[PDB]
Amino acid sequence: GVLYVGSKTKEGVVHGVATVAEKTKEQVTNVGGAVVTGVTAVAQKTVEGAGSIAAATGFVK
Amino acid sequence: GVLYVGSKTKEGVVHGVATVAEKTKEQVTNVGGAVVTGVTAVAQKTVEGAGSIAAATGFVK
Amino acid sequence: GVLYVGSKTKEGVVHGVATVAEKTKEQVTNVGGAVVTGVTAVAQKTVEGAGSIAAATGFVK
Amino acid sequence: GVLYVGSKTKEGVVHGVATVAEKTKEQVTNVGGAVVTGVTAVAQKTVEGAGSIAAATGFVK
Amino acid sequence: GVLYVGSKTKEGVVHGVATVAEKTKEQVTNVGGAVVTGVTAVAQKTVEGAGSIAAATGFVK
Amino acid sequence: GVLYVGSKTKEGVVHGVATVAEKTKEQVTNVGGAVVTGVTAVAQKTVEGAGSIAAATGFVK
């Protein structure tokens, strides 16, 4: 197919994934997998076939 | 296929993944996998076939 | 296929992965895998075949 | 006295005196005297005492 | 007295005196006297005492 | 007195006196006297006492 993205912007501000924690005991932060951030962000066919992206957190204690 | 991305921007500011923790005891930070950040960020076919990207955190204690 | 990325920007500022911790006891920071950051960031076919990128943190204690 | 001018501007465009004539026979253009133009234009005490500024056009024919 | 001019600008464009004529017969252009042009233009005490600035055009024919 | 001019600019463009004529017969251009042009243009006490600046055009024919 044909995918066309045309952006004509001015003074653009983008914030992605932000995590804030305070006055805790145990902190676990697992971020990623397919994180895409930006003024012109394009994600296509991130998974094809039998692939896998598993951003998991196996907390046990 | 055909993928066309056209960006004509001015004064662009992009923030990616930001983690802030304070006054904790145990800190675990696992970030990555397929992190893409920027004014013109393009991600295509990040997974093909039987591949895998597993950004996991196996906290046990 | 054909992938075309055209960026015409001015005064662009990009921040990637930022981690801040304070007043903790145990600090673990595992960042990477496929981190791509920049004004014009392009990631394509980061995984092909049976490959793998596992940015994991096996905290045990 | 005290004269304070404080300007904090961004992307400022100023046009002064513009004259356009077309398909005429006799053209007379007398411009000046105390012309002040600009983003931060200040004019003070342009005339003091018995002075004079006479931007005149004595067309006779 | 005290004259304070404070300008904090960005991307400033200033045009002064512009004259355009076309398809005429007689063209007379007298410009000046006290022309001041610019992003930060300040004119003070341009005339003191018995002085004079006469930007005149004595067309007779 | 005290005259303070403070300019903090970026990417400044200034145009002064521009004259354009086309398809005419007689062209007379007299420009000057006290022409001041520029990003930071300051003119002070251009006339003191019994002085004079006469940018005149005595066209007769």
Q: Is A39 helix (H, G, I), strand (E, B) or coil?
A: coil
Q: Which of F44, D7, D38 is nearest to E1 (CA)?
A: F44
**Alpha carbons D7 and E9: distance in angstroms, whole number:** 8
CB atoms under 10 Å from CB of D8, counted, come to: 10
Residue F27 · residue E28 · CB < 8 Å: no
B and D in touch (3+ CB pairs within 8 angstroms): no
Residue pairs spanning B and C at CB distance below 8 A: 248
Closest partner residue to D5 among E4, E25, E36, by Cβ? E4
C42, β-bridge pairs: B42
Say whether B16 and C17 touch across the interface (CB within 8 A).
yes
Chains touching chain B, criterion 3+ CB pairs below 8 Å: A, C
Q: Which of F31, A45, C30 is nearest to E29 (CA)?
A: F31
Chains touching chain C, criterion 3+ CB pairs below 8 Å: A, B
Nearest C-alpha in F relative to D21? F21
* Helix intervals (H) in F1-61: none
E43 is in an annotated binding site: no
